[PDB]
C-alpha cells in the first residue's frame, strides 16, 4: 500500500 | 476541486449512480473496499441497484473501451459509527492493482498527523471556474492542529476531525469531491488521513478545511473488512  | 490542477491519484475512485454519472469520490483501501463519506448517501439502507465504482482513468467520462478503466458494481454499503461521517462500500469484485490503481495505507489507530505535513486532495468535482471540471484535479494542502483550526472555527471542530491551513487563494474540495481522500505522504508511505466531507463554506480564502480523521475509526474499518 501507499506507493505511487 | 477548486484551485487545483490535473493530476493522478491512483487510490481515488469515482462513485457512479444508476445513470452512470459521477456523484462522489472514494478511497481505495482494500482490493474490494472503498472508504467514502456518509453524506454521499440518502440513508444507510439506500437502494444501490445500478451503482458502480470506476477506477483507473483521469477522465470523469472515459470512452468505455478505455484500457485502464475498471468498472465494478457495488455489493453493499456499511455505515460507520455515529459522528464518523464514513461509509465503507464493498465491491462485487476485487479490483486489479497496477500503476494506475493502487491501495492507500490506513493510519495507526489514534494517530495525529503533525502540523506542517503536506497532503493531497483529489477529485472530479466542481472547479468553480478554476479549471476543467471533467478531469481528476489535485491540490496540495498543509495540516494545522485542531487547536489552531478551532480559533477560526470557534471550537466546532471535533476530536474526530482534522484540519488544513486556510489558503489565500480559493482552494479546496467542494461538491462532487466528497468521499475522496486526504492523502498524506509520511514515513515513506502515502497514508489516508482524512476523508473529504461537506463543510459550511468550501474553498473560501483563509478558512481552514475540515475532514473526518480516519485514524479515529480504523478499528471499525478493520473489523468490517
Helix H or strand E encompassing A2 = none
Long-range Cβ contact pairs of B134-137 (< 8 A, separation 24 or more) = B134/B59, B134/B60, B134/B61, B135/B6, B135/B58, B135/B59, B135/B60, B136/B6, B136/B7, B136/B8, B136/B9, B136/B12, B136/B58, B136/B59, B136/B60, B137/B1, B137/B4, B137/B5, B137/B6, B137/B7
Give the CA diameter of chain A: 9
Q: Does domain B10-103+217-225 have CATH number 2.40.10.10?
A: yes
CB atoms near residue B24 (< 10 Å)? 25
Number of Cβ pairs < 8 A linking chain A and chain B:
20
Please report the DSSP string for chain B in residue order. Answer: -BS-EE---TTEEEEE-TTS-EEEEEEEEETTEEEEEGGGSS-TT---TT-EEEES-SBSS--TT-TT-EEEEEEEEEE-STT--EEEEEESSPPPPSSSS-PPBPPPTT--PPTT-EEEEEESS--TTSS-TTB-EEEEEEEE-HHHHHHHTTT---TTEEEEPPPSS--B--TT-TT-EEEEEETTEEEEEEEE---SSSS-TT--EEEEEGGGSHHHHHHH-
| Cα distance between residue B30 and residue B60, in whole Å | 22
Assigned fold of B1-9+104-216: Thrombin, subunit H (2.40.10)
**Is the separation of the CB atoms in B57 and B17 below 8 Å?**
no
> Would you call A1 and B10 a contact, using CB atoms and an 8 Å cutoff?
no
Q: Who contacts B97 (Cβ-Cβ below 8 Å, separation ≥6)?
A: B31, B103
**Distance between CA atoms of residues B44 and B80, nearest Å:** 9
B103 to chain A: which residues are within 8 Å by CB?
1-2
Number of Cβ within 10 Å of residue B46's Cβ equals: 13
Answer yes or no: are the C-beta atoms of B138 and B9 closer than 8 Å: yes
Residue in chain A nearest B186 by alpha carbon: A2
- The number of beta carbons lying within 10 Å of the beta carbon of residue B169 is 12
Q: What is the distance between the alpha carbons of residues B146 and B24, in angstroms, rounded to a whole number?
A: 26
Structure-determination technique: X-ray
Q: Are B27 and B13 in contact (CB under 8 A)?
A: yes
Q: How is chain B split into domains, by residue range?
A: 1-9+104-216, 10-103+217-225
Resolution in Å equals 1.9
Going by C-alpha positions, the residue among B211, B125, B201 that lies closest to residue B164 is: B211
* Locus of grid cell 467542494: B174
With beta carbons under 8 A apart, name residues in chain A contacting B10.
Answer: 4
With CB atoms and an 8 Å threshold, state whether B189 touches A1: yes
The three three-digit cell numbers of residue B114, written as one number = 503533525
Q: How far apart are CA B3 and CA B21, in angstroms?
A: 23
Amino acid at each position: 500500500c501507499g506507493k505511487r | 476541486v477548486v484551485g487545483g490542477h490535473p493530476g493522478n491519484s491512483p487510490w481515488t475512485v469515482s462513485l457512479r449512480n444508476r445513470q452512470g454519472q459521477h456523484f462522489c469520490g472514494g478511497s481505495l483501501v482494500k482490493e474490494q473496499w472503498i472508504l467514502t463519506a456518509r453524506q454521499c448517501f440518502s440513508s444507510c439502507h439506500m437502494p444501490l441497484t445500478g451503482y458502480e465504482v470506476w477506477l483507473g482513468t483521469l477522465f470523469q467520462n472515459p470512452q468505455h473501451g478505455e484500457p485502464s478503466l475498471q468498472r465494478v458494481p457495488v455489493a453493499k454499503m456499511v455505515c460507520g459509527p455515529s459522528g464518523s461521517q464514513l461509509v465503507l462500500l464493498k465491491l462485487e469484485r476485487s479490483v486489479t492493482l497496477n500503476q494506475r490503481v493502487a491501495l492507500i495505507c490506513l493510519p495507526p489507530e489514534w494517530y495525529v498527523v503533525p502540523p506542517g505535513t503536506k497532503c493531497e486532495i483529489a477529485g472530479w468535482g466542481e472547479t468553480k471556474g478554476t479549471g476543467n471540471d471533467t478531469v481528476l484535479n489535485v491540490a496540495l494542502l498543509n495540516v494545522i492542529s485542531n487547536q489552531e483550526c478551532n480559533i477560526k472555527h470557534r471550537g466546532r471542530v471535533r476530536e474526530s476531525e482534522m484540519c488544513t491551513e486556510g489558503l489565500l487563494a480559493p482552494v479546496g474540495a467542494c461538491e462532487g469531491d466528497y468521499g475522496g481522500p486526504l492523502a498524506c505522504f509520511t514515513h515513506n508511505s502515502w497514508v489516508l488521513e482524512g476523508i473529504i466531507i461537506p463543510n459550511r463554506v468550501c474553498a473560501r480564502s483563509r478558512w481552514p478545511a475540515v475532514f473526518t480523521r480516519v485514524s479515529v475509526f480504523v478499528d471499525w474499518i478493520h473489523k468490517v473488512m
